[PDB]
Enzyme design. Sequence first.
Site, PDB file in Angstrom:
ATOM      1  N   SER A   1       4.681  33.113  60.419  1.00  0.00           N
ATOM      2  CA  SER A   1       5.752  33.810  61.181  1.00  0.00           C
ATOM      3  C   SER A   1       5.241  34.360  62.537  1.00  0.00           C
ATOM      4  O   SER A   1       4.797  33.602  63.410  1.00  0.00           O
ATOM      5  CB  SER A   1       6.351  34.939  60.315  1.00  0.00           C
ATOM      6  OG  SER A   1       7.591  35.424  60.807  1.00  0.00           O
TER       7      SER A   1
ATOM      8  N   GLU B   1      13.917  26.686  56.153  1.00  0.00           N
ATOM      9  CA  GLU B   1      13.523  27.903  56.875  1.00  0.00           C
ATOM     10  C   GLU B   1      14.656  28.913  57.075  1.00  0.00           C
ATOM     11  O   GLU B   1      14.545  30.076  56.679  1.00  0.00           O
ATOM     12  CB  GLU B   1      12.942  27.541  58.252  1.00  0.00           C
ATOM     13  CG  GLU B   1      11.658  26.727  58.204  1.00  0.00           C
ATOM     14  CD  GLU B   1      10.424  27.601  58.100  1.00  0.00           C
ATOM     15  OE1 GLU B   1      10.574  28.840  57.980  1.00  0.00           O
ATOM     16  OE2 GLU B   1       9.298  27.058  58.157  1.00  0.00           O
TER      17      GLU B   1
ATOM     18  N   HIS C   1      11.855  30.409  54.551  1.00  0.00           N
ATOM     19  CA  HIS C   1      10.747  30.999  55.300  1.00  0.00           C
ATOM     20  C   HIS C   1      10.113  32.129  54.467  1.00  0.00           C
ATOM     21  O   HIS C   1      10.844  32.945  53.881  1.00  0.00           O
ATOM     22  CB  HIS C   1      11.275  31.513  56.656  1.00  0.00           C
ATOM     23  CG  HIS C   1      10.232  32.110  57.549  1.00  0.00           C
ATOM     24  ND1 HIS C   1      10.132  33.466  57.766  1.00  0.00           N
ATOM     25  CD2 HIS C   1       9.260  31.535  58.297  1.00  0.00           C
ATOM     26  CE1 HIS C   1       9.135  33.706  58.602  1.00  0.00           C
ATOM     27  NE2 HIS C   1       8.592  32.554  58.940  1.00  0.00           N
TER      28      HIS C   1
END
Length: 566
Positions: free
Chosen positions: A214, A347, A467
């Site tokens: 991230s 994601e 994600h």
Amino acid sequence: VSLMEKLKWKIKCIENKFLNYRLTTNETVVAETEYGKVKGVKRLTVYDDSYYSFEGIPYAQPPVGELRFKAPQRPTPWDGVRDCCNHKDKSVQVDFITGKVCGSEDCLYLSVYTNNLNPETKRPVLVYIHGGGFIIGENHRDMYGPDYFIKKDVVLINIQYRLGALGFLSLNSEDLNVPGNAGLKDQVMALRWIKNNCANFGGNPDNITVFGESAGAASTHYMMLTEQTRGLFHRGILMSGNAICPWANTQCQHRAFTLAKLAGYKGEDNDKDVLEFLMKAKPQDLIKLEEKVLTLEERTNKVMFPFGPTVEPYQTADCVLPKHPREMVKTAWGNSIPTMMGNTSYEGLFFTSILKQMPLLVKELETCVNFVPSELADAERTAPETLEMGAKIKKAHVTGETPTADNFMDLCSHFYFWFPMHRLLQLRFNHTSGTPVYLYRFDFDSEDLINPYRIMRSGRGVKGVSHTDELTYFFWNQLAKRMPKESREYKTIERMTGIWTQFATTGNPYSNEIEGMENVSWDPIEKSDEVYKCLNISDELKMIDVPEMGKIKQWESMFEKHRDLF
């Protein structure tokens, strides 16, 4: 976050405290550092392995008082034994469960883990940079436990760095010496510490792998772009992010004033008087008020965070981002080390929670102009050219007459992750020695073993691989449990920690000593490649063409008449 998740977390925090006490031993050890001796402790894991643990090692001066907002300084050496048997506090931040501010301005520490303090050969050094959008996160073991990695013969390090406005306030006035990127400058100094000290823990200073997820991924990439760290490490893994993601930099030089005003400042907009106010304010007050800083204009144009990495307005000694990141790729020493990048299979499925509080966001797909890259879209998002790029986006993700929630989260996968990965790869090819870059796509879905971010994104009983879903298979966390050794979960832990350690050791991620990689032929991407090939990690490990390619190319067509901006 709901009261029930609140109490549930409170109970797990209480559980984790007692567990940590139990999993501790009496076996303490002393290591040398260039700053003085440190005392670590051995601990246990629930898989009946053990490891040496050094926590709360300072790599920077405490950045309090007059050092606040400033570039970090080297810590003061001590002569005796520093007690590293306990974790220090996290950078000041809002707790995503409770909603209250926690942490401390004294946060610039790192942790060093290893199964063996005196290895017969020097080992791969793995450095984890946590994500959290540059505003939350920590190197505490209730979130990033080394328990899986210590099964392998590595040295694993988890660093902290200043978050938020304390980490990333930026001022134009060159006299005030707050150019910005203090948080990244924190990361640089930790690396120099790891370079010069990892041998005392049995690490090979000539074989260091930095990796992150991230904002941790954009940090890792920033660490590969800046001149400040040239030759400091030798491998990089970018997991769901890089420095040209739209959320990974922002020009925030005006937003300091907004923050001072929210926090009680009386006076005018000049940088000096603003800085003096912010220097005296309570850290918890500054951090609490970061949420309110962004205008409606900025949120509309998908500005995600007020304070974060920025092009510094004037060059200082410790300067990290002297140009826009796209310009830095063209001169990056990092372009010439072995690299692994990848994304999860869904994601954008992260954004389900945000969608539930903002149903209206789905109507944005009607023209999609708000997702046109900022540098191509006009101010009001109303120019005919803008509606035209918007249309190329809509054709790519809207499947029916009317836009759905899944179209939206699908679009986000590309807006925030796939398209920026596409732009980096291409741009990198034009400026590189030709060191390999390897792609993975993490496609493994389990609800039996989870991590805390599932609580945040409201990911209870939601299928698909969002994600941060992959973090569960790299680190222990206080929501985890022991898995049977035959379980699909356990096997993916072995595979993931295996590949990463394999890549970290050799600069090449393939091994036939990993279960399932028998018929795998994992090639690096060539600039000649029209289609990206990636190892797809589900229950089976299979090389495929990147399934997101068609959409990726559609996004690229927006730059048809603007190929210099690509």
